[PDB]
């Protein structure tokens, strides 16, 4: 112990010194590295505060005693398919009106007064309850007149400021994340009582939406309808025309991503038809690829993720078509419910339009692309439409449609993507309308041929 | 009594291992309910390995922990291999791995929603390393003081998951348990080594020296302390992954990098304020835990010619173990800049959980030849051989599966046989090993100013 004291002294203490200020200066480098490398490293964007519903597709149900069943009808039933609709990872349930409605008066008409037919007020209590807990969130439409010939009452429903005014605050008080109103066109100048309404549901609180609706396909009235309020979520007949011409569905979906280039948007057929009311057959597994990538938010009626044909099955009403539970959810004359419509039917097959909508919904409202990546649409085969969605450092997208006869190859010509999103020459395959096409593969954008009426979706995650 | 027992012991097995591990198990498990499950098991497992541990202990008396248990259970032969085994493997590996956690979650306030570079984790990882052993050899008082205050940021580390996973139980937010034991296919072939993840939490028994002379009453107070505070921290430890599994569904937790932060961001407001700084707190406890842990170890095994005599040698003033820290620092860079979480953890449990398998085997002998030797505690023998018979069943099968990184492993344990070399040879070739290791003797003492303990 001595010795070793005698031994710190000069001469070889100054070797003593010079080995911890080396591990000092090597320790100081580490430190200034780790922290250069902080500084070096991309710092991301700000996620922009998603809403619950900017996550998934909304979900419309009209007539319940079709949604349930004939004579079964009743608020408390949703209760036992609120599961079901949890299962199809969607956000919301335009569930509506159940108000008291008698008919064609507006006297004899009130929002504030829950249908009994539907059953009361007891077991809505237990359809919020209930919903809270899935995180299915419920939205209320309040049309009033929805029994009679017009949708809204026809001499002058002047009361809607102070009717639906009292609506917006009630049954927010309740705890109705939203609501909607429909045909807008005969609100007569809807975009001041839209106005009205919107200011009332966001100023309430930002997290309670209100949609609006109307049979219009020209972009001025929509744009018109969008005059001054530009958080209303309008679903339009813009794409109510069948279109599938390689201009159409693309020239109408970038003129409208062009209006408000980037202004959240609601992407739907229709207002309260299903898609088969328009859509032909082989495009229903099509449009469902489309709807659930473009930018915005998605809304379905009820059976339109398993494509309910009027066409196929008779007896249906053209309105309110009879949704298929099990092997006799069709109360009328029977025969034609065959194991391919149902929806047990379909929630086994994995190559099903139920199994398809499943996967579409999972990755929509699960993956940070699809929720809120920029959109980017280039130029591609003549019947055709291609894009990308793409967010700071997360996973790409790419999606192909073929809507014509003849199988075409893909014709990327990009040429003009930014270079924190251009195209790599293969692509991690992830799924297809038409299957068969090993789901998995990366697929090369060359060789890219496709077969008619088929969609793709891709992934190339570079640094994305 | 027994009250200030179980403190004592609960405060080492709690630590950084309930942030590493769950998303470790549900990996190669393939479900919850099934991965809940592995938890409960290894807790169980867990118990009886420091239950047998226990008694080891208390039939030997010869003091100096797991080192001992194995010198003359079985001889000097597999004590020689333990001591190199455990310097060359698992202690360095167990730093790197609870290191490679708090790095990445020191660094998760600053990259809130990004994906952090592996090289800033491994470079802030070895700063904390070299900040951890200049505390350890700087002074001794304020790493004991640190101590206490970290591994009371270790309790909250984990009442702060714990409280806001039951209050959104006694709410209601049972959805991810529905199909428990159902999920990936997850064959056995990758069973063993969630096994590795899930022993892993519990970790803090093995150099857990008990003493018979201060303890009070043994026979009572020893297996009364281990058996009623193993159950509190399964119990703990079950709780934190059902409030784990609660928030956060099988899928996302599997894609995450860090658990506790998405788990406090989404459920807290001020989640990047308290949650990753409380888990690198909690590290940097676990880290801390190397204090004279290892430098003990250096001191009973140099004492009968295993180690090198610098190697047990504390300094001048500032008493410290200078000389066993950097010996532990180079293999901990050595580690952690060439290797993965994921494969660092199958090189550490490999070779702790063999020559633990190997050693409470070594009960199932004492008590059978040469018995009936100042046994105040006696465990049935039904807890040794069913810890011996699962842990060298879930290591020799963890070599059908992942070779490459416990392969490697058990080459380096293997190559302690021929190692035996240096404790035993006809001649060490005076100039030629003799001459350079008294040089390096000189040097290292004269360097590092460190003299023998007492001696
Ligand atoms: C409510 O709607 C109106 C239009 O109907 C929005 O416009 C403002 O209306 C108030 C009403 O007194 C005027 O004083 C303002 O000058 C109008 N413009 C602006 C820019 O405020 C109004 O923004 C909407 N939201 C509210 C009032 O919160
Ligand atoms: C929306 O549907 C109506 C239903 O016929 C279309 O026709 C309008 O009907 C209302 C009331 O029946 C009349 O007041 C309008 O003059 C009708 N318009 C036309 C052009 O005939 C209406 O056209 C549809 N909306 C659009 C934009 O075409
Ligand atoms: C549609 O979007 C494109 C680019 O996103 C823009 O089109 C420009 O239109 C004006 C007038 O028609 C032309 O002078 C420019 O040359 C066009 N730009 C390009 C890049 O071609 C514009 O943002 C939108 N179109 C309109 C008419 O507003
Ligand atoms: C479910 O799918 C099968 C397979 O296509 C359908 O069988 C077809 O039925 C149509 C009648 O609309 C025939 O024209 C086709 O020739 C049939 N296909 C084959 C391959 O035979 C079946 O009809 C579908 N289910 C229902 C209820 O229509």
């Not at chain 1, 429903?157 to 639906?164: I, R």
């Not at chain 1, 744009?223 to 979520?233: A, G, P, R």
């Not at chain 1, 990366?442 to 994305?464: D, I, Q, S, T, V």
């Not at chain 2, 950084?16 to 809940?36: D, E, Y």
Request: net charge neutral.
């Amino acid at each position: 112990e001595e010795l070793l004291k005698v031994a710190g002294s000069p001469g070889w203490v100054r070797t003593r010194w010079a080995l911890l200020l080396l591990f000092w200066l090597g320790w100081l480098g580490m430190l200034a590295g780790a922290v250069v490398i902080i500084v070096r490293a991309p710092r991301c964007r700000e996620l922009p505060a998603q809403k619950w519903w900017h996550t998934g597709a909304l979900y419309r149900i009209g007539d319940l005693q079709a949604f349930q069943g004939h004579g079964a009808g009743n608020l408390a039933g949703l209760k036992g398919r609120l599961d079901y609709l949890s299962s199809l990872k969607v956000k919301g349930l335009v569930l509506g009106p159940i108000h008291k409605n008698q008919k064609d008066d507006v006297a004899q008409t009130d929002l504030l007064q829950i249908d009994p037919n539907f059953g009361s007020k007891e077991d809505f209590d237990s359809l919020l309850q209930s919903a809270k807990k899935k995180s299915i969130r419920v939205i209320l439409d309040l049309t009033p007149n929805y029994r009679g010939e017009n949708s809204w009452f026809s001499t002058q429903v002047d009361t809607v400021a102070t009717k639906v005014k009292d609506a917006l605050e009630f049954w927010l008080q309740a705890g109705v994340d939203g609501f909607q109103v429909r045909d807008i066109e005969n609100l007569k100048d809807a975009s001041s009582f839209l106005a009205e309404w919107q200011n009332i549901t966001k100023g309430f609180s930002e997290d309670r939406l209100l949609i609006a609706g109307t049979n219009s396909s020209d972009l001025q009235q929509i744009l018109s309808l969008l005059e001054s309020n530009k958080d209303l979520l309008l679903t339009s007949s813009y794409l109510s025309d069948s279109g599938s011409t390689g201009e159409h569905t693309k020239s109408l979906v970038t003129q409208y991503l062009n209006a408000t280039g980037n202004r959240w948007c609601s992407w739907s057929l229709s207002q309260a038809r299903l898609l088969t009311s328009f859509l032909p057959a082989q495009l229903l597994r099509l449009y469902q690829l489309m709807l659930f990538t473009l930018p915005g938010t998605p809304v379905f009626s009820y059976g339109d993720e398993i494509g309910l044909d009027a066409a196929a099955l008779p007896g249906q009403p053209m309105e309110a078509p009879v949704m298929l539970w099990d092997e006799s959810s069709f109360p009328d004359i029977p025969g034609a419910v065959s194991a391919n419509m149902t929806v047990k039917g379909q929630s086994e097959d994995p190559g099903s339009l139920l199994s398809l909508f499943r996967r579409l919904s999972d990755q929509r409202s699960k993956e940070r692309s699809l929720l809120h990546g920029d959109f980017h649409a280039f130029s591609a085969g003549p019947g055709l439409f291609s894009y990308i969605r793409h967010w700071d450092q997360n996973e790409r997208f790419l999606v192909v449609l073929n809507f014509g006869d003849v199988g075409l190859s893909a014709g990327l010509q990009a040429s003009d993507l930014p270079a924190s999103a251009s195209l790599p020459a293969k692509a991690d395959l992830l799924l297809s309308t038409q299957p068969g096409r090993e789901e998995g593969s990366p697929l090369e954008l060359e060789r890219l041929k496709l077969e008619p009426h088929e969609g793709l979706l891709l992934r190339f995650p570079y640094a994305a | 009594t027994l009250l200030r027992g179980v403190s004592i012991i609960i405060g080492t097995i709690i630590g950084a291992g309930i942030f590493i591990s769950p998303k470790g198990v549900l990996q190669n498990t393939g479900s919850v309910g099934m991965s809940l499950t592995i938890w409960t098991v290894c807790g169980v497992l867990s118990l009886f390995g420091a239950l047998s541990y226990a008694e080891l202990g208390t039939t030997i008396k010869k003091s100096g922990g797991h080192y001992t248990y194995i010198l003359e259970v079985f001889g000097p032969l597999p004590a020689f291999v333990r001591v190199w085994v455990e310097l060359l493997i698992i202690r360095p590996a167990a730093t790197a791995v609870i290191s490679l956690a708090f790095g990445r979650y020191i660094l998760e306030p600053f990259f809130i929603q990004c994906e952090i570079p592996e090289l800033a984790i491994k470079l802030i990882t070895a700063v904390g390393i070299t900040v951890v052993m200049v505390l350890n050899s700087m002074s001794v008082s304020w790493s004991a003081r640190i101590q206490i205050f970290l591994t009371f940021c270790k309790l909250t580390a984990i009442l702060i998951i714990i409280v806001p996973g039951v209050m959104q139980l006694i709410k209601g937010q049972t959805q991810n348990f529905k199909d428990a034991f159902s999920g990936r296919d997850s064959s056995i072939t990758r069973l063993p080594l969630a096994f590795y993840y899930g022993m892993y939490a519990y970790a803090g028994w093995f150099y857990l020296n008990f003493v018979t002379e201060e303890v009070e009453n043994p026979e009572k107070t020893i297996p009364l302390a281990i058996c009623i505070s193993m159950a509190i921290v399964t119990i703990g430890y079950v709780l934190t992954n059902v409030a784990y599994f609660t928030t956060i569904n099988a899928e996302e937790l599997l894609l995450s990098n860090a658990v506790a932060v998405t788990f406090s961001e989404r459920l807290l407001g001020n989640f990047s304020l308290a949650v990753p700084i409380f888990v690198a707190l909690s590290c940097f406890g676990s880290m801390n835990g190397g204090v004279f842990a290892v430098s003990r170890l250096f001191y009973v095994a140099s004492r009968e010619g295993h180690l090198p005599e610098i190697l047990s040698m504390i300094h001048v003033r500032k008493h410290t173990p200078l000389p066993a820290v950097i010996v532990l620092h180079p293999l901990t860079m050595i580690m952690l800049f060439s290797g993965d979480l994921d494969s660092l953890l199958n090189f550490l449990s490999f070779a702790r959980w063999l020559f633990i398998g190997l050693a409470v085997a070594g009960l199932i002998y004492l008590r059978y030849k040469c018995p009936d030797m100042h046994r105040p505690f006696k465990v049935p023998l039904f807890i040794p051989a069913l810890f011996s018979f699962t842990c060298l069943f879930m290591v020799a099968l963890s070599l059908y599966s992942d070779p490459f990184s416990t392969g490697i492993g058990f080459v380096i344990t293997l190559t302690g046989v021929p190692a035996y070399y240096l404790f035993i040879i006809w001649d060490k070739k005076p100039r030629w090993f003799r001459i350079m290791s008294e040089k390096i003797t000189r040097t290292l003492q004269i360097i590092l100013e460190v003299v023998p303990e007492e001696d």
